[PDB]
Amino acid sequence: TIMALYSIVCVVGLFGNFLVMYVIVRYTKMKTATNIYIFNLALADALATSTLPFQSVNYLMGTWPFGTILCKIVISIDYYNMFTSIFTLCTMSVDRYIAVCHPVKALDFRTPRNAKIINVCNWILSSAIGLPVMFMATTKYRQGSIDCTLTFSTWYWENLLKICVFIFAFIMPVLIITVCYGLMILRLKSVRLLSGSREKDRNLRRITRMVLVVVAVFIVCWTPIHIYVIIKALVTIPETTFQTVSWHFCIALGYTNSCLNPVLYAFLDENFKRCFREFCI
């Protein structure tokens, strides 16, 4: 039955993203700074959800049939998503911060053309974890069924990769986002008019609320899996059926976040809400 649930979320995951991805390009009215980052976020989620049928098929076969390079690319996508999503959210939070606190500087510093380079900078930065993880990935003939796993030079590297990913992928971006929004709330809850007009302050507050909701959903969804990985790699918990089902539920909950964003944009943003029905009309 758990296989059906994965099928439901995956189909919605790809269904939401490409429709969102097409929309941002197919209308000049959505070329603002935030949609550039939304494009990257949707791209990352769509790539992360592309490998779901490949991985899930291995339940009933237990043998990787596709090839070693495809296992390499799947592991690479999985390891990319965790970095790219969080770094994109951090960049979004920083962008909203400069928009709120420094509107005069943001007038010249937030152009979309120069905000496009932030995406490739994010990809380059995540590439440092993408390629080595991609590098060691290659199929190895197990004790009777082909297993797509990793290899090292292991008591050192298997722990080193985990501590590095936990430190440089979760805690620092979470702290940066928290500080940014702590400044944002202080700025918002004291000034009555930001841009000097009633037609801009409302839109700015609405867009900041949307960013906050997306960030909170992402944090809630992705929190359990990192803690579970750390505790599993530290304490060496004795195996149990309940432990197995909890560990699998954590991964499922982590993956389900990729399909929520295209729907979460529908009930918070007016442009996307109207233009979804515009296609349907």
Curated annotation (Swiss-Prot):
A motif (NPxxY) lies at residues 261-265. It is a multi-pass membrane protein. Residues 23-35, 95-114, 183-206 are cytoplasmic. GO terms for molecular function: beta-endorphin receptor activity; G protein-coupled receptor activity; G-protein alpha-subunit binding; G-protein beta-subunit binding; morphine receptor activity; neuropeptide binding; voltage-gated calcium channel activity. Phosphorylated. Differentially phosphorylated in basal and agonist-induced conditions. Agonist-mediated phosphorylation modulates receptor internalization. Phosphorylated by GRK2 in a agonist-dependent manner. Phosphorylation at Tyr-97 requires receptor activation, is dependent on non-receptor protein tyrosine kinase Src and results in a decrease in agonist efficacy by reducing G-protein coupling efficiency. Phosphorylated on tyrosine residues; the phosphorylation is involved in agonist-induced G-protein-independent receptor down-regulation. Ubiquitinated. A basal ubiquitination seems not to be related to degradation. Ubiquitination is increased upon formation of OPRM1:OPRD1 oligomers leading to proteasomal degradation; the ubiquitination is diminished by RTP4. A lipid is attached at C280 (S-palmitoyl cysteine). Changing K200A: Impairs interaction with calmodulin. The modification Phosphotyrosine is found at Y97. Expressed in brain. Isoform 16 and isoform 17 are detected in brain. GO terms for biological process: adenylate cyclase-inhibiting G protein-coupled acetylcholine receptor signaling pathway; adenylate cyclase-inhibiting G protein-coupled receptor signaling pathway; behavioral response to ethanol; G protein-coupled opioid receptor signaling pathway; G protein-coupled receptor signaling pathway; G protein-coupled receptor signaling pathway, coupled to cyclic nucleotide second messenger; negative regulation of cell population proliferation; negative regulation of cytosolic calcium ion concentration. Keywords: Cell membrane, Cell projection, Cytoplasm, Disulfide bond, Endosome, G-protein coupled receptor, Glycoprotein, Lipoprotein, Membrane, Palmitate, Phosphoprotein, Receptor, Transducer, Transmembrane, Transmembrane helix, Ubl conjugation. It is found in: Cell membrane; Cell projection, Axon; Perikaryon; Cell projection, Dendrite. Disulfide bonds join C71-C148. The chain crosses the membrane at residues 1-22, 36-60, 72-94, 115-136, 158-182, 207-233, 242-265. Residues 61-71, 137-157, 234-241 are extracellular. One of its GO terms (cellular component) is axon. Belongs to the G-protein coupled receptor 1 family. OPRM1 is the main physiological target for most clinically important opioid analgesics. OPRM1-mediated inhibition of voltage-gated calcium channels on central presynaptic terminals of primary afferent nociceptors is thought to be one of the primary mechanisms mediating analgesia at the spinal level. Opioid-induced hyperalgesic responses are observed following both acute and chronic dosing associated with cellular excitation. Receptor for endogenous opioids such as beta-endorphin and endomorphin. Receptor for natural and synthetic opioids including morphine, heroin, DAMGO, fentanyl, etorphine, buprenorphin and methadone. Also activated by enkephalin peptides, such as Met-enkephalin or Met-enkephalin-Arg-Phe, with higher affinity for Met-enkephalin-Arg-Phe. Forms homooligomers and heterooligomers with other GPCRs, such as OPRD1, OPRK1, OPRL1, NPFFR2, ADRA2A, SSTR2, CNR1 and CCR5 (probably in dimeric forms). Interacts with heterotrimeric G proteins; interaction with a heterotrimeric complex containing GNAI1, GNB1 and GNG2 stabilizes the active conformation of the receptor and increases its affinity for endomorphin-2, the synthetic opioid peptide DAMGO and for morphinan agonists. Interacts with PPL; the interaction disrupts agonist-mediated G-protein activation. Interacts (via C-terminus) with DNAJB4 (via C-terminus). This is Mu-type opioid receptor. It comes from Homo sapiens. The chain holds residues 72 to 354 of 400 of the full protein.
